[PDB]
Amino acid sequence: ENVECEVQEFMFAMTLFSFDQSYEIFQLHDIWKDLLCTFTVPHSAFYYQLSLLFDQEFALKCISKSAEYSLQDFKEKQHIHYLNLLIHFEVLDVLRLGHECRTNFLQLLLQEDIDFFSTLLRLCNAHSDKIVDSILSQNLRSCFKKLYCFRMLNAAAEVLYQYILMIRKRKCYLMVINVLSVTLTDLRDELRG
Amino acid sequence: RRKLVVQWIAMAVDMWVREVERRGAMAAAVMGSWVSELLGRADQVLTQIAGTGATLRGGAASDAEEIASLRRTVKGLKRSVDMLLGGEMARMSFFR
Amino acid sequence: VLSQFYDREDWGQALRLLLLLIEFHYLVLLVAKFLYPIFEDSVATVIEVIETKWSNLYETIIEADKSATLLKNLRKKLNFKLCQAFM
Amino acid sequence: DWVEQLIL
Amino acid sequence: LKDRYEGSEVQNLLDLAEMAIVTSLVQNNELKTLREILNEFVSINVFEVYLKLVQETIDSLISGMKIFYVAACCNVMSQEIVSKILEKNKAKLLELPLQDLMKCTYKI
Structure with missing residues (x-):
């Protein structure tokens, strides 16, 4: 405060950081090894x-x-950091749509995501009512499973349910019939047999 | 290292979901909203860890895709848990 | 009706209504109308059973309520399924 | 009693 | 006859053809079928096959008409949709465009 009164500004910043004042001063203007870098x-x-x-x-x-303020390496890093910070403290859908507009990276990120993630996905689907869709379907395919799959696809649902079926029986047949509303007749006959 | 705690939660809830699905098929022949909230906070922890990992001194963290995968798994579990909580758990003994 | 006048209670009442419908066309229509107005696994199962179960007087009642029916019912069922999936 | 007769 | 009743193709190669194509619904087999058809020389299916081996709008209209003429037709329609999606990966594209419903909605 004394001895400082461009260079003095940066000094004040790094000194006040070693936080509001620091950030403010720094932005307004424009460990040692990192500083040098x-x-x-x-x-x-x-x-x-x-x-x-x-x-x-x-x-x-x-x-x-x-x-x-900025918005391959830098982008990916920033995105990952932001997502992690937000999940620690919406962000998911945002980052996803952003990057869509490094696929395996996203596969790993969603891997970490997988309840909160599911809720976010449900929210995105509700809002809506390619690559992203496929990646999601693959991750889901990797009760709970069938439900998530169905929710996302909203044929895939029906296929998954049929495969799992190949109380539970009744529930499945029923869900299938409601979604479809040949298949219905077959389901009914099976439930009656 | 809370990354690892989130992975344990993901694995535990996953087994819990499988157990509920199995118990539903069983009776054809508890989970509260707090589990859903817990997975939301878990997603926030992962968003926070990834961000901190991207700005570490010396270079970004190597676990970028590892965390992106965990995010997907957590979202998938929150989806399943949200469907069960939302009515699919009272209709487990019914034919689909 | 008393329960209705008085969330879990509402669900219990809806369940009772579905059970009554199963035991018993006009009644089914009234039930569908009530469900639409309201708009988990057990609930879904009930909705399904109702869909499986699914004349002039019934149509008249439907018209009075609105003041096509099958389609509205299917739409409501779809909405319920979506809600269950989100949960 | 009334709720047992409704379930039946 | 004994095959239709017990639920063949080379014999057919030597309506019904459409039903056989229906049952078939791999690339090499398709090519062989095409060659057999050329040797013999319905038209809509031929146009579709030619497109698959590869005017586009005409082929599309032909395929739609074939679909109108049930499960196999829907499968063929879905295949055409997938192929179009692969090709895309503006006005002409919109013209070409003009579960299946859900897919169409996602596209829009």
Whole structure:
């Protein structure tokens, strides 16, 4: 506060970080090894470094802000970080639609996702009412299973149910008949036999 | 390392779902909303861990796709649990 | 009706209604109307049984209620199934 | 009693 | 006759043909069937086969007409849809476009 009064600004930032004041000053303007790397790079780098160093509120905030201001490696990293932070504290669907508009990466992310994930998916489907769809179907195919599959596909449902069937019987036949409303006749005959 | 805790929760809930589905077929021949909320928080923890992993000093974390996979599994389980909670559990002894 | 006037209670009442319908066309229509107005596994099973179970007086009653029926019923069933899947 | 006769 | 009644194809190669195509609903077999048809020389199916081995709109209309003329037809329609989707991967595309319903909705 004293001895500082561009260079003095950055000094004030890094000093006040070692958090609100720091971030504010830094943004307004424009461990040692990391700092050197950041200087060499010269916003994204700075936020990434801060997030890494506090890895917390400050970190997460800075990271999110930078990611927002920016929007293969960098993109993927940022996305993963944001998703993790949000699941720790919507985000899923956003990131997904974003990247869709690195497939195996997404497969792993959804792997981590798999109850909250299911709820988010349900929400997305409700909102709606290619690659993404296929990936989802594959992950689901990897009671609970049949239900999730059905919900997502909303033929796939029917196929899965039939395969599982090949109280439970009655429920399945019933669900199939309602969804369809040849197949019905067959189901009825089977239930009667 | 709460990544690993989330993986344990995913595995436990998965077995629980399979058990409920098995017990439903059994009787043809408890789970509350708190389990669904728990999987939502679990997804938030994973979004938080991945973000922190992307900004670590020295370089991004190597577990990016490993966490993306866990997210998918958790969403799939929240879907199944949400269907059971939403009525599919009272209709387990019925023909589909 | 008393239970209706008084969420779990509502579900119990709906279940009772479905059971009554199973034991017994007009009644079924009234039940469908009630379900639409309201708009888990047991509930789904009941809805299914009803669909499986599914004249002029009935049509008249349906018209009075609206103030096609089978289609509306199917739509309601689909909605219920979706809700169960989301849960 | 009334709810046992309805279930029947 | 003994085959139709017990629920063949080479004999047929030597209406009914459409029903056989229905039952068949792999690529090599399709090609062989096409060659047999050429040797013999319904038209709609031929157009569809030619497209599969590979004007497009005419083939589409032909296939739709065939579908109208049940399960096998629906299968063929789904296959055509899948092929179109693969080809896509603006106005002309929209013209070509003009569970199946759910798929169409997702597309829109």
